[PDB]
Design a protein around this ligand. Structure first.
Ligand code: CHL
Ligand code: CLA
Ligand code: CLA
Ligand code: CLA
Ligand code: CLA
Ligand code: CLA
Ligand SMILES: CCCCCCCCCCCCCCCCCC(=O)OC[C@H](CO[C@@H]1O[C@H](CO)[C@H](O)[C@H](O)[C@H]1O)OC(=O)CCCCCCCCCCCCCCCCC
Ligand SMILES: CCCCCCCCCCCCCCCCCC(=O)OC[C@H](CO[C@@H]1O[C@H](CO)[C@H](O)[C@H](O)[C@H]1O)OC(=O)CCCCCCCCCCCCCCCCC
Ligand SMILES: CCCCCCCCCCCCCCCC(=O)OC[C@H](CO[C@@H]1O[C@H](CS(=O)(=O)O)[C@@H](O)[C@H](O)[C@H]1O)OC(=O)CCCCCCCCCCCCCCC
Ligand SMILES: CC1=C(/C=C/C(C)=C/C=C/C(C)=C/C=C/C=C(C)/C=C/C=C(C)/C=C/C2=C(C)CCCC2(C)C)C(C)(C)CCC1
Ligand SMILES: CC1=C(\C=C/C(C)=C/C=C/C(C)=C/C=C/C=C(C)/C=C/C=C(C)/C=C/C2=C(C)CCCC2(C)C)C(C)(C)CCC1
Lengths: 183, 68, 35, 76, 348, 31, 35, 30, 25, 30, 24, 490, 30
């Protein structure tokens, strides 16, 4: 069982077969001399041992799973309501733009310009924050029902609910990736 | 004497930041040696198919591959 | 104000090797170049 | 210790190397004179170069089927 | 170790045993040199002694057949094996050792273990020069025998129709490969061999002159007529007058070395530049990009029946080599030449 | 004695006397 | 399926491990107990 | 024409031989 | 053959005897 | 006599000749 | 009259038709 | 100061001038690519793609544009032999201009990085000196490499978004640029499968992204930092020169042997196709397909494409050339005009005869006429004083089938010897030695010239790997050895 | 397109170009 985890975190379990989030030590080697005007150039030396990202890794699972939960819930119902495969969208939308059977006026060239402005600028604003708990869990308009007044630092698990559903949605879309080309 | 600060230079600044910093010990060297020997084994696959030294029944290994 | 400024030198013995090298290669190869 | 001239002048070197060295020379003599060298390496004996099928030099002429062809060229 | 004091793993226990100052240095390279170089030498001495060439070439090449040191060889595989590596587990040999020798697979045993032997020997002298803390110029000079070996034994047959046209490992077997390149490639005329001769035959000059210039400008540091006794390798002064040596050749030959360091690098430079250029010419002959013909003298000698040079004599001699050896040099072609179609001068 | 210097010489010398016994018997093979 | 050429090839990478391992096993045996 | 080029390359090589002997950089002692 | 081993086994036992002729001395 | 070889000979002379003359007269004035 | 095998035997004899299956 | 061979090492210490000096080399390489493509378009003759194709004309970089989809021109013509109705922007001249426009843009960028060399990006924090984080710098560039590799493989080659690559038949007759599907079985490692090229760059592109993410994050070991000398910009040079001669042996190897990435309609046939009788067997396979169904000789030999008979010719063999036999293949034997027929030889006993073809080694080769069973029956003898296989006595006539001499017979013993000496060179063709003033002796294809450069470069880059690997391991003793270094003996 | 004018152009460039480069790089190093 790992020791560098299991506290103040939703998935309090040591699943890691390899310890990707292991805080490792570091040692700093000096820069090698490359001056020709010296007679001898040395290969550098050990200078500084450094004692030493679980906060960075927590944010990056949350983004992938939430895109997966928009993907898995979005591919089952567009296959249900419209009646087209989730891989086939793009081949049938370049020909005719639609949403739930309703024709849309946009050329496919405009969709590149729409998506890199709208989704792009929103992605440029997410990394404009410098607090890792606020980066994982922001406030403001994204919490209209006030989860942030409810605590989870104790045995309360009011935050440990998206994180399990983010996990298998990545897996069920990984199951969609092993099904698309092959089968 | 400080260098020349540029807007692209500070956007790329943390990429040229941790120069000289290393893991202690051997790290992932034993992991690397597994990947070198698999790639050594992989390069012996494609060397012998193209030499007709390992024969696979699925390949044609001729210009007749361009037919089917 | 680059500190990495160096000069190239070429003494006359290296001139005489260099001029010889490109004439002997021209003695050698031009018989093939003119074919 | 032992710098190549106290070995060759020592008598214990020659109470070994006057027994193992001739028995290894004879072992090389008998490897060929019992005809075993013609069998291990597949070199033909002076009465084995030309069978009755061919009276010419062999020619292997086939890549993947050379193993049983050289058995037919040799006459086995 | 490493000026940060980690604990030694099993590598450090293996590194200091390999890098041991025993009688013969093994090192890390010796895990590659000593198994491969012993099997190239062991494969050559076995193949020249016992292994036939009666099936790959139709000709006897071992001591047990009747050959001597000059005519015995470890001969190349047949042209029917193409570039097959002829592994003893290969699709041709298929585990049988006594047929792997008959199929000429013991050629590629020597050629591959000799090729990785040369890598093991060149890494040996990087490894020793880093132990002794010298400069690595002994290895850089050995790039040129590896440039010769790879371009002739490996690169040349890969561009031809098979490993058949490789050199066999013998004395008379190298000699036909030499006569193969005159008859077929006109390889004397190739200007990369001409730079290869001037490097090889110019390093032999520099070896003989520098040896004789040193040995005849020595300082009288002893009393007796043996001048070899008047030397201790821990002496700080030069053992021979460089100033006398310079004035001698500046009046004999007109031009002399005045720099001792430039001299010994020039002795390094000439055989290496010579072999790297000649290796490029054998790379050119792998594709049959020959320097065979001067076309301006073939057009003239075909439009003028009295224009004879030593060049057109050489072209006629190569026609003689090509037609008179290839009924026996290339038995895979199965070409029979009736005696009236081979070229022939008057009364010979 | 099984050292590195022992394995260097007897890697060379032991097959050398084996083949010199072989090559000497080849001089008396008539046909 | 698997050809005999692939059977001998995979058997060579097993035999290439028992050779390259045993050369490595011999230099980590002499390194430890010195024989 | 090419024989004019051949002799110019041979005269030019013999020119460098003349300058390398009689106009060499003289070896200064000490 | 046999005579290639008979005179071989002769000096195999002669040099064993002559090697012991100076080993007894 | 071709247009290539007569001027390839002249470029293989003069482009490396003068390059070495650029470096020598630089050096011999120092 | 002539098979394609024994037309490429007297013309080239290095032919990939003539070299394979040549155990007969 | 410095020697002449050491002048470029003023750039080893400052990374800003290293950008500027690789930018100038990159401006010269793409400046060559556009300039060579403008030179090749200005001399290319697109009239006959069947019997005077691009590899016949000395085009070197035009089969590299045509390999990745560029088939049309701003002169109307295409490669497959039709008129381009919309050449687009990615013509041959559009790409020849796109490399020159890039050459001047990279030129100006190099002038910028030469003057503004002292950027703060190149100085690491809290030591203030110029330093480069070569494990992460490699992790950046390996990430971009696998991203382009996956982009080229999934989109350009597969035809999902890009055009595709060149795919032809086994016999070089029907060849186009069409999209390929990736092949993920064992068949993807057959290098004559074009589907293995797309399946390569997807799988190697994905792994190169995943490996790039490793080297971005995981710092190296300290023991493997010193042992590979990671803190030097020359230990990446030695390992990269090692990477590019490895690649250049593979690249020149697959060019010489032939691969799906080297089509024969672009680069010409290989020397192993003349040797192994590749086109000759198929030409005989199609005659016997017609004589078995019921047809005449002259009506069966007419059904063979004139392009297929041109591959069966020793002058298009890339190994029938010379190192200083310069130029196009058309400069050697002439521009091919028409297939002149199939020479069939019969003697006075009504027996067919077959000219023993010239092997690839032979500059000259005696003409021999063998029977069905492989026995020499006629030749052109060298000694004619007492002959027993002369064409004159054996009575060799020659008849043609198909081609320009169809149904025409020659019994003249001077005429028969002329076509017997052309029949050892392959199929019979009619050339013109007046259009380009041809010499008369063959040249090598671009398949042979590319292979010659890229093995001579791969061999000279072995020495540069040896030199620059030695200058990293022996960096401390480059200017000489220490005075007390006598402790290394007993 | 003649043999004269194509190489007279190249000699009128390179022989005075490099002569001026010999004198400049001599001077710019002083
Ligand atoms: C970011 C996630 C993302 C993923 C995993 C995919 C993956 C896919 N897209 Mg898609 N796209 C994605 C975002 C986008 N796509 C497109 C525009 C298209 C187009 C125009 C097409 C696809 C197609 C496809 C499918 C087949 C791939 C192919 O090569 O078809 C080629 C193989 C057979 C046709 C596949 C499911 C293709 C498709 O739907 O074909 C069935 C297709 O034509 N995508 C846009 C811009 C609007 C996207 C925005 O980010
Ligand atoms: C990030 C996830 C994601 C992505 C990339 C897409 C992308 C797409 N969806 Mg999906 N969808 C999603 C989430 C997502 N949806 C979710 C969460 C739901 C549940 C409400 C749906 C329900 C849904 C339906 C019911 C349909 C689509 C359709 C479409 C396609 C075109 C319509 C469009 O985007 O206009 C968006 C315009 C306004 C919001 C497009 C391929 C339509 C289609 O034609 O697919 C082929 C369609 O019929 N989607
Ligand atoms: C993005 C811009 C761009 C584009 C689209 C093109 C497009 C083209 N170029 Mg140009 N070129 C460019 C930039 C570009 N070039 C630049 C910047 C240069 C200067 C360096 C050149 C120099 C150049 C030359 C000299 C030539 C071309 C040619 C071509 C054509 C064929 C390319 C080809 O076959 O290459 C084949 C490419 C490869 C085989 C790639 C080799 C890379 C190796 C395999 C990867 C090994 C390292 C890798 C990192 C390993 C890790 C992999 C993985 C683990 C990540 C094509 C029209 C050719 C042509 O016909 O032009 C006239 C030609 O001869 N280009
Ligand atoms: C299922 C996925 C898949 C598929 C179908 C392929 C398919 C292919 N790969 Mg790719 N590959 C993949 C995944 C895949 N790859 C992945 C995940 C990786 C890891 C990143 C690679 C890495 C890779 C490399 C590095 C190479 C290939 C090559 C190939 C080709 C093999 C056939 C060939 O041309 O042999 C020809 C190649 C060889 C026979 C290689 C032998 C190497 C020799 C020994 C080098 C010789 C030089 C050396 C210094 C020897 C000295 C000189 C000598 C004369 C003495 C084929 C297109 C090869 C290629 O592109 O060839 C054109 C190649 O070099 N692949
Ligand atoms: C790897 C690089 C490469 C390759 C394979 C090719 C291949 C080819 N080129 Mg291209 N070319 C290249 C680089 C390359 N080129 C570059 C860099 C340039 C710019 C200068 C050109 C400019 C160019 C033109 C302008 C032409 C070609 C032509 C050709 C074709 C004929 C080859 C030939 O005659 O070789 C000749 C080979 C040799 C003479 C052997 C070289 C051996 C060494 C290098 C000689 C050097 C020795 C000595 C030091 C020189 C001094 C002698 C002095 C008298 C000059 C062939 C398809 C011709 C063609 O067919 O176009 C349609 C053509 O007209 N090329
Ligand atoms: C990626 C390839 C590469 C790179 C970046 C370098 C870079 C370097 N090398 Mg290395 N080298 C390489 C390949 C490479 N080399 C190869 C392949 C060899 C084998 C021939 C060498 C052999 C070598 C030696 C022996 C030495 C270097 C040295 C140097 C340094 C100074 C070079 C200099 O001042 O040249 C100056 C060159 C000139 C002023 C003129 C050279 C003209 C020649 C004839 C080439 C003509 C240019 C031609 C038009 C370009 C075609 C090149 C072709 C590859 C396309 C520099 C760090 C030196 C060093 O380490 O210094 C300490 C040194 O002594 N190199
Ligand atoms: C000491 C250990 C050295 C191990 C390596 C060298 C092995 C050489 C083997 C030669 C051999 O066995 O000949 C063995 C051959 C065999 O002798 C032959 O036997 C046949 C029997 O079937 C035939 O009867 C032949 O006629 C008969 O001559 O001996 C000879 O050829 C006679 C001359 C022997 C002298 C060879 C001199 C070689 C000197 C130069 C060596 C090359 C330079 C080396 C450096 C590079
Ligand atoms: C600065 C510019 C000046 C620099 C110096 C200029 C000379 C440098 C040395 C040049 C050497 C080559 C000169 C060729 C002369 C010639 O006759 O060309 C003449 C040829 C043109 O040839 C003509 O072509 C015509 C069709 O366009 C016709 O066919 C004509 O008949 C034919 O004469 O020019 C070239 O081919 C140049 C090709 C250069 C690259 C060839 C392949 C190189 C691959 C090997 C690379 C490594 C080599 C080993 C290195 C070690
Ligand atoms: C006709 C021969 C065959 C033709 C060959 C054609 C190719 C020739 C290739 C070689 C060219 C010379 C290489 C470099 C020589 C060098 O640096 O010398 C260095 C010495 C410097 O020595 C110092 O020179 C000093 C004078 S000064 O410093 O130069 O002003 C002087 O004071 C001092 O004593 C002395 O030590 O130069 C001299 O002594 C005199 C100046 C030489 C001028 C260059 C001559 C150029 C050749 C022209 C020949 C006619 C060509 C046309 C007809 C064919
Ligand atoms: C400014 C600018 C511009 C322009 C540009 C240009 C114009 C460019 C060009 C460029 C170019 C025009 C380039 C070129 C290049 C070339 C090269 C770079 C070459 C080289 C060569 C070589 C390298 C060779 C080599 C060799 C030899 C020596 C011989 C043979 C062999 C070999 C191959 C090795 C414009 C207006 C657009 C606009 C923008 C800006
Ligand atoms: C091959 C092979 C193998 C096996 C084995 C081996 C490896 C062996 C080795 C062997 C060896 C390693 C041998 C050796 C030999 C030697 C010899 C054979 C020598 C001889 C010599 C001589 C003969 C000499 C003479 C003389 C002279 C000249 C000089 C001096 C004097 C005298 C006179 C004596 C293996 C298994 C691996 C694998 C497979 C392959």
């Amino acid at each position: 069982r790992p020791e560098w985890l299991d506290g103040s975190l939703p998935g309090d379990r040591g699943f890691d077969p390899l310890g990707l989030s292991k805080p490792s030590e570091f040692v700093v080697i000096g820069v090698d001399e490359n001056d020709q005007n010296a007679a001898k150039n040395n290969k550098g030396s050990v200078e500084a041992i450094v004692q030493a990202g679980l906060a960075r890794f927590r944010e990056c699972e949350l983004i992938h799973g939430r895109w997966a939960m928009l993907a898995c819930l979005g591919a089952l119902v567009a296959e249900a309501t419209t009646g087209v495969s989730w891989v086939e969208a793009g081949k049938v939308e370049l020909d005719g733009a639609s949403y739930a059977g309703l024709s849309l006026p946009f050329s496919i060239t405009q969709l590149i310009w729409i998506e890199v402005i709208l989704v792009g600028g929103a992605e440029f604003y997410r990394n404009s924050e410098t607090n890792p708990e606020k980066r994982c869990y922001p406030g403001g308009v994204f919490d209209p029902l006030k989860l942030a007044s409810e605590d989870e630092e104790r045995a309360f698990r009011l935050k440990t609910a998206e994180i399990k559903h983010a996990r298998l949605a990545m897996v069920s879309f990984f199951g969609y990736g092993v099904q698309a080309l092959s089968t | 004497e400080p260098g020349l600060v540029t807007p692209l230079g500070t956007l790329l600044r943390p990429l040229n930041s941790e120069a000289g910093k290393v893991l202690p010990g051997w790290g992932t060297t034993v992991l690397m040696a597994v990947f070198i020997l698999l790639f050594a084994a992989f390069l012996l696959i494609i060397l012998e198919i193209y030499n007709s030294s390992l024969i696979l029944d699925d390949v044609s290994m001729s210009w007749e591959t361009l037919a089917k | 104000p680059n500190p990495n400024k160096q000069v190239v030198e070429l003494n006359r013995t290296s001139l005489y090797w260099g001029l010889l090298l490109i004439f002997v290669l021209a003695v050698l190869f031009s018989s093939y170049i003119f074919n | 210790e032992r710098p190549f001239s106290d070995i060759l002048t020592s008598i214990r070197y020659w109470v070994i190397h006057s027994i193992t060295v001739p028995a290894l020379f004879i072992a090389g003599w008998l490897f060929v004179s019992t005809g075993l060298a013609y069998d291990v390496f597949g070199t033909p004996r002076p009465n084995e170069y030309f069978t009755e099928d061919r009276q010419e030099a062999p020619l292997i002429t086939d890549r993947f089927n050379a193993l049983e062809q050289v058995k037919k060229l040799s006459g086995n | 170790i490493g000026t940060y004091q980690e604990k030694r793993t099993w590598f450090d226990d293996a590194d200091d045993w390999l890098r041991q100052d025993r009688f013969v240095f093994v090192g890390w390279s010796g895990l590659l040199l000593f198994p491969c170089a012993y099997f190239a030498l062991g494969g050559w001495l076995t193949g020249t002694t016992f292994v036939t060439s009666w099936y790959t070439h139709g000709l006897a090449t071992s001591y047990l057949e009747g050959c001597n040191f000059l005519t015995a060889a470890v001969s190349t595989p047949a042209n029917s094996m193409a570039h097959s590596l002829l592994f003893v587990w290969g699709p041709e040999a298929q585990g049988d050792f006594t047929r792997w020798c008959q199929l000429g697979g013991l050629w590629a045993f020597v050629a591959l273990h000799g090729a990785f032997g040369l890598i093991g020997f060149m890494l040996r002298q990087f490894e020793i020069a880093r132990s002794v803390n010298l400069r690595p110029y002994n290895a850089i000079a050995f790039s040129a025998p590896i440039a010769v070996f790879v371009s002739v034994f490996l690169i040349y047959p890969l561009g031809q129709s098979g490993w058949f046209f490789a050199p066999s490992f013998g004395v008379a077997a190298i000699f036909r490969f030499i006569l193969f390149f005159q008859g077929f490639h006109n390889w004397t005329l190739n200007p990369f061999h001409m730079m290869g001769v001037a490097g090889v035959l110019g390093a032999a000059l520099l070896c003989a002159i520098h040896g004789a210039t040193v040995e005849n400008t020595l300082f009288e540091d002893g009393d007796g007529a043996n001048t070899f006794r008047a030397f201790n390798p821990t002496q700080a002064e030069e053992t021979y007058s460089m100033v006398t040596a310079n004035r001698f050749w500046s009046q004999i030959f007109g031009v002399a070395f005045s720099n001792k360091r430039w001299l010994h690098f020039f002795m390094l430079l000439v055989p290496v530049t010579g072999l790297w250029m000649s290796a490029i010419g054998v790379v050119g002959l792998a594709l049959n990009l020959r320097a065979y013909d001067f076309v301006s003298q073939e057009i003239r000698a075909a439009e003028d029946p009295e224009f004879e040079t030593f060049y057109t004599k050489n072209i006629l001699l190569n026609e003689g080599i090509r037609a008179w050896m290839a009924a026996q040099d290339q038995p895979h072609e199965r070409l029979v030449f009736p005696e009236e179609v081979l070229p022939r001068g008057n009364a010979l | 004695i099984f050292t590195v210097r022992w394995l260097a010489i007897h890697g060379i010398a032991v097959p050398t006397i084996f083949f010199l016994g072989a090559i000497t018997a080849m001089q008396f093979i008539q046909r | 399926a698997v050809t005999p050429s692939l059977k001998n090839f995979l058997g060579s990478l097993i035999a290439g491990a028992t050779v390259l391992g045993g050369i490595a096993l011999a230099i980590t045996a002499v390194s430890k107990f010195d024989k | 024409m090419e024989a004019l080029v051949y002799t110019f390359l041979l005269v030019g090589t013999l020119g460098i031989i003349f300058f390398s002997i009689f106009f060499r950089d003289p070896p200064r002692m000490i | 053959g046999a005579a290639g081993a008979a005179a071989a086994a002769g000096a195999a036992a002669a040099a064993a005897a002559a090697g012991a002729a100076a080993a007894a001395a | 006599v071709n247009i290539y070889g007569l001027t390839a000979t002249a470029l293989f002379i003069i482009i490396p000749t003068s390059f070495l003359l650029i470096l020598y007269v630089k050096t011999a004035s120092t | 009259v002539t098979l394609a095998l024994d037309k490429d035997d007297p013309a080239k004899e290095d032919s990939v038709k003539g070299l394979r299956k040549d155990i007969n | 100061g410095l020697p002449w061979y050491r002048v470029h090492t003023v750039v080893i210490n400052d990374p800003g001038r290293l950008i500027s000096v690789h930018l100038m080399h990159t401006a010269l390489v793409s400046g060559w690519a556009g300039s060579m493509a403008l030179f090749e378009i200005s001399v290319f003759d697109p009239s006959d793609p069947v019997l005077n194709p691009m590899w016949r004309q000395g085009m070197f970089v035009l089969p590299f544009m045509t390999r990745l989809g560029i088939t049309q021109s701003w002169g109307g013509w295409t490669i497959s032999g039709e008129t381009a109705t919309n050449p687009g922007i990615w013509s041959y001249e559009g790409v020849a201009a796109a490399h020159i426009i890039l050459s001047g843009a990279l030129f100006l960028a190099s002038v910028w990085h030469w003057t503004y060399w002292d950027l703060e990006l190149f100085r690491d924090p809290r030591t203030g000196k110029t330093a480069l984080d070569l494990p992460k710098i490699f992790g950046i560039h390996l990430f971009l490499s696998g991203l382009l590799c996956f982009g080229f493989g999934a989109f350009h080659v597969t035809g999902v978004f890009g055009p595709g690559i060149w795919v032809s038949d086994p016999y070089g007759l029907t060849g186009r640029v069409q999209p390929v599907a990736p092949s993920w079985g064992a068949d993807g490692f057959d290098p004559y499968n074009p589907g293995g090229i797309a399946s390569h760059h997807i799988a190697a592109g994905i792994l190169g992204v995943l490996a790039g993410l490793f080297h971005l994050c995981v710092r190296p070991s300290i023991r493997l930092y010193f042992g590979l000398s990671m803190g030097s910009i020359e230990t990446v040079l030695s390992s990269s020169i090692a990477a590019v001669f490895w690649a250049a042996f593979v690249v020149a190897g697959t060019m010489w042997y032939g691969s799906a990435a080297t089509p024969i309609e672009l680069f010409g046939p290989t020397r192993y196709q003349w040797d192994q009788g590749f086109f000759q067997q198929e030409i005989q396979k199609r005659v016997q397909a017609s004589l078995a169904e019921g047809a005449s000789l002259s009506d069966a030999w007419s059904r063979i494409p004139e392009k297929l008979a041109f591959y069966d010719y020793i002058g298009n063999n890339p190994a029938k050339g010379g190192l200083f036999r310069t130029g196009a293949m058309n400069s050697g034997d002439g521009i091919a005009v028409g297939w002149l027929g199939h020479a069939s030889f019969k003697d006075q006993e009504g027996r067919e005869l077959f000219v023993r073809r010239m092997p690839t080694f032979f500059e000259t080769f005696p003409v021999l006429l063998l029977d069905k069973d492989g026995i020499v029956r006629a030749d052109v003898p060298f000694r004619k004083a007492e002959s027993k296989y002369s064409i004159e006595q054996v009575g060799v006539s020659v008849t043609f089938y198909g081609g320009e001499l169809d149904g025409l017979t020659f019994t003249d013993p001077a005429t028969v010897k002329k076509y017997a000496r052309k029949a050892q060179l392959g199929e019979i063709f009619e050339f013109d030695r007046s259009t380009l003033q041809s010499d008369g002796v063959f040249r090598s294809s671009p398949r042979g010239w590319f292979t010659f450069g890229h093995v001579c470069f791969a061999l000279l880059f072995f020495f540069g790997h040896i030199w620059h690997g030695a200058r990293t391991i022996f960096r401390d003793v480059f200017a000489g050895i220490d005075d007390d270094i006598n402790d290394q003996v007993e």
